[PDB]
Structure 1
Amino acid sequence: PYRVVVLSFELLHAPATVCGPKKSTNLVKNKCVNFNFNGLTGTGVLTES
């Protein structure tokens, strides 16, 4: 016998509540920073919307 577990999920389209062991940092605005919002990586300037 073999035990099999299949894990299903979607990525980067809907709000997520699991996440990984990455530790969060502070929010720095009006500056060019690398960001990681719920797994979405990129570069840009964050401003109030």
Structure 2
Amino acid sequence: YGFQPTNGVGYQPYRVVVLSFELLHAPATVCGPKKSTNLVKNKCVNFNF
């Protein structure tokens, strides 16, 4: 590419980042802004592990 500043859009350089989340079968890894919140037992509950 010979990029030049006086190029019409669609010929100017774009930077690209491709995030690819993979989950082969690990036991746990990165996440997001969770909360932890304690747990319980013996009660019908709505859970996320």
Per the normalisation by structure 2, the TM-score is 0.57
Identity %: 100
CA radius of gyration, larger in: 2
RMSD: 1.5
Q: Unpaired segments of 5 or more residues in structure 2?
A: 1-12
The yes-or-no answer on 1:24 pairing with 2:23 is: no
Higher normalized contact order (CA 8 Å, seq sep 6+, divided by chain length): 1
Q: Distance in 2 between matches of 1:7 and 1:25?
A: 29
Give, in angstroms, the shift of residue 27 of structure 1. 1.5
- In the TM superposition, structure 1's runs of 4+ consecutive aligned residues that sit over 3 Å from their partners are none
Gaps of 5+ in 1: 38-49
**TM-score normalised by structure 1 residue count:** 0.57
